[PDB]
Design a protein around this ligand. Structure first.
Ligand SMILES: Nc1ncnc2c1ncn2[C@@H]1O[C@H](COP(=O)(O)OP(=O)(O)OP(O)(O)=S)[C@@H](O)[C@H]1O
Ligand SMILES: Nc1ncnc2c1ncn2[C@@H]1O[C@H](COP(=O)(O)OP(=O)(O)OP(O)(O)=S)[C@@H](O)[C@H]1O
Ligand SMILES: Nc1ncnc2c1ncn2[C@@H]1O[C@H](COP(=O)(O)OP(=O)(O)O)[C@@H](O)[C@H]1O
Ligand SMILES: N[C@@H](CCC(=O)O)C(=O)O
Ligand SMILES: C[C@@H](O)[C@H](N)C(=O)O
Ligand SMILES: [Mg+2]
Ligand SMILES: [Mg+2]
Lengths: 354, 120, 325, 316, 335
């Protein structure tokens, strides 16, 4: 069947079970949705932002928002480069991820979204006389990944055509969002669930799946290992249950993403040996990680925080590590090729440790 | 494509690179192994009804991008295989719409109380 | 029709006698046309110094009032690729005059926007048809011009407008309009002009608009500052004094009050303070280094937006640390 | 739920042509069509609100708002055996237009060959598969050719939700188009199809102005030059988050205008070429209705009706 | 009634005429007197987000021409449109060269109808330098029948020749001192009941952006209406809606920084980032706390001001919030 992440996905505002204040605020937003402003939900990845957006859409329109189909929209660049984008559509709303088009994301904003904003939605009234108009809802996934040009192109589209369109953007951090876009949106903070709420959800799933649990401490350990990511918590719960014949025990290992263990091994190697050859081996590991399309900034963050957890290191080493991490994160943001900056960070760490 | 057309689930590419690309294949591989074991036991002979729903040729059970070996026209062929599996997925969903729709709750019992009559 | 025009275009010089601040260049070109020995010309200079006006006036003097018939003018708004150079410019330069009126004139305004290929194609066109045609190039950035083109042209530099020329032009505008300007207002206008006549004319038009009764009201420096929203010298002096003498809290409060009084922008205050400090007598040279580096960094950061209060505190701290040396 | 029907093309060819045109338009307008079989008439409906059509989400992606309704009097069918236990013995189904169109095309081919047989249609329960049934269709070819089409029945609650649009008749201006069979038919047919000469034109602005006492115009402003097309020939005039669409103030009491899409205009042209009596109704900045009427008498008989409602593509 | 209540408050209360524009009188006076002088120059509006530039230009065009004539006298282009060099050299040039359309008798009797068109280039700072250069002589040559209006947030992105050609108008930041009246009028129109000082708090939080303040007020009004208790809105609710870190959390962060233990700071920051607080707001609050504190010396304040400036610049570059925040906190702890 479907993965437990999607199997037990809440489908309504009243079905939510953590961050009750956010649920109440969302319900207040849906009281009079006629004048609903553009929304920008920001929060840690995997906390349930898309789920809450879908719940709000369901409250405004109904369960039909969850009936989703996929279409392919074709775009042509100036150089005639033909490419395609996936548009997820429901009878009441549309879903797009322009960042999938990289530097061409702006085209998606200039051609597709604008057109959607320009075409007023009207329909014959079933009972009353005359047409009826309803604004279209559009969701922009990974808003923080948009290039500055696409964000600039969004401005007048949001303003002029507010009657026909209402945007709901979702992001993990607002730092890459340009100030004009933040000015045009209602900002909604989405806190991560606490360990207790994650454990409660996992225990509910366990009860539903008839999985024998030795003690509830296993769920707490899984929640701790997930670092507040409920999706990861559910995925590891399913993996552990399947690998243990649906009978979890305190001795059952906790499965973590493979790249995370790889980064931990890289950190251990960096701490142990510091030399040019060690740096070349670390570069090989970094290139292997990048081959799997892991973002460079995520790699840098994971490596930095893995290094900071090493007990043998002292305060000065950790301070130098965080300094270098900040500098090279800025370099990555302003750079073109990530390998230079990751290798430079590792070299600086090796110099400071030795 | 497989997820969208078999489980009505939409996931971002970023989440696939980070979480799903490793966890989902492992789960599907474990489910397939359990299904094979159960089938063998039955041949040699409801609780796990969600486990034998995995199709051998349609469900991905391998880590996306291969294993991360770090510290422990192929592209054309892969695209052709992806297009083929997408065609099969579209075929599986094409008939589902006409076959039945959720619509709303109605008096289904009364509908059966007035059955079609065909005779000359 | 001229009344409806903006002052920047309404007061465009029509004759070479109306171009001020370029006495040497103007005299040279006037005598060249008097002797009928015009060479290929390059006019290099910063914005709003009179290059386009000067060249158009020279064309008018050479060809009277029918210059449009034997002058080929091209600028950045037109396409000037290699094909254009090969066909249009070449055909115009290789054809006889309309009525045998001496030589033809080709004006390439804003030639620094032309591509390298077009400039390279222009070399032999300029050289071969020198007898029948003369070329005039205008530029603000010489690094965009190829060495060959620079070598082929006689160079004339349009300096930033001197103060006296600006005063004479302002007097002409004031007599034209029914406008009165105060000496302090004129001094402030010249100071903010930075040698650009366009800025002077635009600010004067805005000041006239600001007057409730321009028929009798006189423009004061306060009117100029209001129209431009720029800080007064007293505000800059007070801010610098507070930064260099008072404590952090007092300096922060003083900066906030001075900015909130008239909604001043931080970049304007930074520029004014930099100008003031450029004349300061510093006995330690590292202070100048730190001031310049930190203030340039703050200006660059401001150019991209950011947090205004943090930037102001950064300016205060940078000045204090630099002067602590 | 017996639905035994007999169709013959050699008797009353007007009815057969009307049915063929209705099925063709519904097939070209949307993938699936609703069929209501009443004790008095058969209604063929193409609406985006149908269960199968709403899946495509045409309304929110391409503005598919037009609604097509066709009424076929029971006199068209030689045998009309419709017995049901609902209001006025009404049986509702949702069929696929492609298969029905293919079957009717084959029937037309056979008829053109020279056969004079009859087509028998019935509702059957296919054991192969809102239960899904089959529309068994059989006919002879001078050889008993039989084909079956899947069909889905609808409940009373589902049937009642599909309602015909109602327009404000008092605030509606109707023009009687010249007959196609008349001397002016070709001129008006060319006039309607004129805008098709411009490939890049997507919207057309229809206007009707009093002062044969009315005139009709088609305006195009999507080109580099303003374009106006005028018909100077004779033309007689017949005497939730939902919000109301904003209507622009009328320029004058005797001018009615509306902006629509070119595809809807092509459909209207096809309808005009199909039928004889055609009426164009305009609701200023609101909608355009194409009404094709077929008249037959014996005690006048029921009037065959085809109504196509088109919502405004843009505001005025 | 529902039709009017179908718009967000920012668009619902967009100024209609130049009289409704607030706090920008230094330029509004000139623009208004242009209606009588008919001597409109080329304009360069520049200023921070949500200060009334687009609203001002739209109101000016409406007052100059009117609902009917505007459609033939105005050409608007913004970032959502293609604005390459070819566009500037063909479409903008063609419109600038267009003959002035004949006003109708009603237009002449009702509106001044100046004898020129207007080309508006909103978000002009997104245009390339070459495309900007392509406008230089088009603006001068056709100034008799066309006037240009460029609008931007970053004036340095406009090439110097274009800035010289255009008369410059700087839109000031809208704060609790110059924009309070408009916000109070908007609240009164919507019958929003709030405690004394709430509007000033909203304006202070918005930091020069009236659009953000209006959106915050609308959110607070929606929350109050949903609650339906009849009580006045409070500053705490406004702060919570605005994403302001609670004072107790900031105090905890300050004590952690004062402790100076790297591991405790790391753990606290890791737990803190789970809530999702925006790093910019935390940095701004820390700057306000430290710079205005009387318990620290001049050297500490200079160093912390430079550190905060560096961190804010890095964040503006679009960096990882967790890393930058941890680095800033560690640096402050080592001071
Ligand atoms: N020397 C001058 N004497 C009088 N007015 C001047 C002078 N230079 C500029 N102006 C004024 O400023 C306007 C613009 O002058 P231009 O000659 O077009 O500027 P420019 O030197 O061409 O700068 P660029 O390179 O085009 S940005 C003229 O129409 C005059 O009103
Ligand atoms: N000066 C002002 N007077 C009245 N309302 C204002 C003012 N400035 C902003 N607003 C409000 O904020 C909304 C947006 O105003 P805009 O004119 O678009 O701001 P802006 O300067 O264009 O912001 P940018 O530069 O596009 S991010 C308006 O519709 C008003 O509701
Ligand atoms: N209140 C809740 N109860 C149960 N599960 C939840 C809840 N909120 C979120 N989830 C789970 O978290 C998973 C990921 O949430 P999602 O919205 O994709 O995170 P993101 O904010 O990164 O989009 C979902 O599969 C969902 O099942
Ligand atoms: N910091 C310098 C003072 C610089 C100055 O006053 O010019 C000492 O000596
Ligand atoms: C003030 C003190 O530092 C001086 N500038 C030296 O010595
Ligand atoms: Mg010039
Ligand atoms: Mg704007």
């Amino acid at each position: 069947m479907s993965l437990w992440v999607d199997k037990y996905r809440p489908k309504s505002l009243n079905a939510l079970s953590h961050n009750e204040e956010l649920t109440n605020f969302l319900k207040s937003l849906s009281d009079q949705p006629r004048d609903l402003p553009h929304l920008l939900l920001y929060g840690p990845n995997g906390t349930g932002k898309k789920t809450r957006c879908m719940a709000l859409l369901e409250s405004i329109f109904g369960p039909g928002v969850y009936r989703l189909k996929i279409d392919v929209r074709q775009f042509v660049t100036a150089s005639n480069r033909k490419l395609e984008l996936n548009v997820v559509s429901s009878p009441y709303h549309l879903e797009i991820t322009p960042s999938d088009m990289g530097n061409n994301d702006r085209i998606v904003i200039q051609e597709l979204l604008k057109e959607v904003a320009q075409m007023e939605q009207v329909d014959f009234q079933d009972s009353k006389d005359g047409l009826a108009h309803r604004y279209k809802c559009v969701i922009i996934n990974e808003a923080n990944s948009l290039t500055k040009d696409a964000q600039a192109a969004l401005r007048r589209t949001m303003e002029k055509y507010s009657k026909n369109i209402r945007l709901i953007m979702v992001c993990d951090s607002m730092s890459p969002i340009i100030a004009p876009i933040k000015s045009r949106c209602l900002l909604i903070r989405c806190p991560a669930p606490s360990d207790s709420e994650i454990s409660t959800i996992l225990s509910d799933v366990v009860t539903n799946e008839r999985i024998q649990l030795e003690t509830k401490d296993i769920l707490k350990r899984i929640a701790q290992a997930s670092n507040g990511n409920l999706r990861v918590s559910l995925l590891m719960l399913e993996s552990m249950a399947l690998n243990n014949e649906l009978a979890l025990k305190s001795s059952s290992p906790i499965i973590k993403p493979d790249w995370i263990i790889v980064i931990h091994k890289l950190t251990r190697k960096i701490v142990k040996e510091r030399s040019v050859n060690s740096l070349i081996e670390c570069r090989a590991v970094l290139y292997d990680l990048l081959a799997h399309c892991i973002p460079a900034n995520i790699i840098l963050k994971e490596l930095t925080f893995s290094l900071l957890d090493v007990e043998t290191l002292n305060t000065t080493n950790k301070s130098s590590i965080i300094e270098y991490s900040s500098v090279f994160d800025e370099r990555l943001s302003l750079g073109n090729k990530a390998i230079f900056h990751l290798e430079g960070f590792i070299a600086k760490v090796m110099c400071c440790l030795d | 494509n497989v997820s969208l057309y078999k489980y009505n689930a939409v996931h971002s590419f970023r989440n696939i690179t980070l979480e799903f690309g490793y966890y989902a294949p492992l789960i599907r591989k474990c489910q397939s192994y359990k299904k094979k074991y159960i089938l063998y036991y039955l041949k040699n002979l409801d609780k796990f009804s969600d486990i034998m729903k995995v199709e051998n040729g349609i469900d991905v059970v391998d880590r996306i991008g291969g294993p991360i070996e770090a510290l422990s026209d192929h592209l054309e062929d892969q695209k052709k295989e992806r297009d083929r599996r997408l065609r099969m997925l579209i075929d599986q969903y094409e008939r589902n719409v006409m076959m039945a729709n959720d619509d709303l709750e109605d008096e289904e019992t009364s509908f059966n109380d007035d059955p079609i009559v065909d005779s000359d | 029709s001229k009344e409806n025009l903006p002052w920047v275009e309404k007061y465009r010089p029509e004759t070479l006698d109306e171009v001020y601040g370029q006495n040497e260049v103007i005299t040279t070109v006037r005598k060249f046309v008097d002797e009928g020995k015009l060479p290929h010309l390059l006019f290099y200079g910063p914005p709003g110094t009179g290059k386009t006006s000067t060249i158009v006036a020279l064309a008018r003097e050479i060809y009277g009032k029918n210059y449009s018939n034997m002058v080929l003018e091209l600028n950045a708004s037109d396409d000037r690729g290699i094909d254009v150079v090969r066909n249009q410019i070449k055909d115009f330069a290789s054809t006889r005059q309309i009525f045998s009126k001496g030589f033809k004139l080709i004006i390439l305004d804003e030639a620094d926007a032309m591509t390298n290929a077009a400039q390279n194609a222009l070399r032999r066109v300029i050289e071969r048809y020198t007898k029948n045609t003369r070329f005039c190039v205008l530029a603000n950035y010489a690094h965009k011009l190829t060495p060959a083109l620079l070598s082929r042209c006689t160079r004339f530099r349009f300096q930033p407008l001197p103060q006296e020329a600006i005063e004479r032009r302002i007097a002409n505008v004031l007599v034209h309009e029914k406008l009165k300007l105060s000496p302090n207002a004129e001094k402030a206008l010249i100071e903010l002009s930075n040698g650009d006549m366009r800025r002077v004319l635009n600010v004067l038009q805005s000041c006239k608009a600001t007057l409730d009764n321009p028929d009798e009201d006189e423009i004061s420096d306060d009117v100029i500052y209001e129209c431009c929203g720029a800080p007064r010298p007293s505000d800059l002096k007070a801010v610098l004094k507070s930064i260099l003498e008072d404590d952090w809290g007092t300096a922060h409060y003083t900066l906030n009050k001075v900015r909130s009084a008239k909604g001043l922008a931080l970049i304007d205050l930074i520029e004014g303070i930099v100008k003031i400090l450029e004349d300061y007598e510093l006995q330690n040279e590292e202070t100048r280094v730190h001031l310049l580096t930190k203030l340039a960094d703050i200006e660059y950061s401001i150019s991209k937006g950011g947090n205004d209060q943090i930037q102001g505190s950064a300016v205060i701290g940078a000045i204090k640390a630099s002067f602590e040396n | 739920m017996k639905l035994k029907l007999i169709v013959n093309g050699c008797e009353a060819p007007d009815d057969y042509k009307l049915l063929r045109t209705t099925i063709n338009t519904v097939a070209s307008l949307r993938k699936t069509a609703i069929l209501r079989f009443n004790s008095e008439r058969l209604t063929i409906i193409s609406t985006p609100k149908s269960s199968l059509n709403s899946s495509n989400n045409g309304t929110i992606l391409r503005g598919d708002t037009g609604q097509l309704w066709c009424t076929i009097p029971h006199d068209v069918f030689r045998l009309y055996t419709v017995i049901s236990a609902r209001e006025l013995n009404t049986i509702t189904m949702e069929c696929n237009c492609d298969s029905l169109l293919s079957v009717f095309k084959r029937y037309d081919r056979v008829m053109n060959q020279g056969s004079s047989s009859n087509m028998t249609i019935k509702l059957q329960s296919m054991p192969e598969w809102n239960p899904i049934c089959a529309l068994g269709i059989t006919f002879e070819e001078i050889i008993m050719h039989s084909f079956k089409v899947p069909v889905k029945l609808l409940f009373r609650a589902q049937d009642t939700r599909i309602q015909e649009p109602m327009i404000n008749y008092i605030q509606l201006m109707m023009y009687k188009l010249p007959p196609i069979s008349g001397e002016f038919g070709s001129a008006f047919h060319g006039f309607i199809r004129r805008v098709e000469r411009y490939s890049n034109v997507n919207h057309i602005h229809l206007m009707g102005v009093k002062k044969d006492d009315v005139e009709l115009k088609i305006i195009v402003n999507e080109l580099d030059w303003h374009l106006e097309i005028c018909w100077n020939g004779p033309l007689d005039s017949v005497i939730d988050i939902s919000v109301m669409v904003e209507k622009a103030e009328q320029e004058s009491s005797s001018t009615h205008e509306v902006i629509i899409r070119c595809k809807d205009w092509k459909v209207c042209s096809k309808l005009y070429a199909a039928f004889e009596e055609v009426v164009l109704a305009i609701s200023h900045d609101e909608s355009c209705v194409f009404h094709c009427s077929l008249d037959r008498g014996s005690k006048p008989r029921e009037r065959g009706q085809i109504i196509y409602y088109i919502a405004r593509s843009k505001g005025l | 009634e529902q039709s009017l209540a179908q718009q967000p408050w920012v668009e619902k209360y967009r100024p209609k005429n130049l009289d409704e524009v607030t706090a920008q009188d230094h330029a509004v006076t000139v623009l208004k007197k242009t209606l009588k002088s008919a001597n409109l120059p080329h304009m360069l509006f520049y200023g921070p987000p949500g200060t009334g530039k687009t609203s001002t230009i739209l109101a000016l065009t409406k007052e100059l021409y009117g609902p009917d004539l505007m459609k033939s006298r105005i050409l608007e282009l913004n970032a959502s449109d293609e604005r390459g060099i070819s566009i500037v050299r063909e479409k903008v040039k063609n419109f600038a060269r267009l003959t002035v359309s004949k006003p109708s008798k009603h237009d002449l009797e009702n509106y001044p109808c100046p004898p020129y068109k207007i080309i508006i280039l909103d978000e002009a700072d997104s245009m390339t330098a070459d495309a900007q250069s392509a406008l230089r002589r088009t603006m001068e040559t056709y100034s008799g029948v066309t006037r240009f209006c460029l609008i931007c947030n970053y004036v340095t992105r406009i090439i110097d020749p274009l800035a010289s050609r255009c008369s410059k108008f700087r839109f000031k930041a809208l704060d609790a001192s110059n924009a309070i009246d408009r916000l109070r009028f908007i609240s009164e129109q919507e019958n929003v009941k709030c405690d004394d000082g709430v509007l000033e708090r909203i304006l202070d939080i918005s930091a020069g952006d009236l659009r953000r303040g209006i959106t915050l007020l609308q959110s607070a009004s929606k929350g109050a209406q949903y609650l339906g208790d009849g009580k006045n809105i409070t500053s705490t609710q406004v702060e919570e809606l605005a994403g302001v870190v609670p004072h107790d959390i900031l105090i905890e962060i300050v004590e952690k920084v004062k402790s100076g233990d790297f591991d405790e700071i790391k753990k606290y920051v890791n737990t803190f980032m789970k809530s999702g607080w925006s790093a910019a707001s935390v940095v701004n609050q820390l700057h306000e706390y430290y710079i205005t504190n009387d318990n620290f010396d001049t050297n500490f304040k200079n160093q912390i001001s430079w550190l905060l400036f560096t961190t804010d610049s890095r964040l503006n570059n679009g960096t990882n919030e967790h890393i930058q925040l941890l680095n800033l906190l560690v640096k402050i702890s080592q001071l």
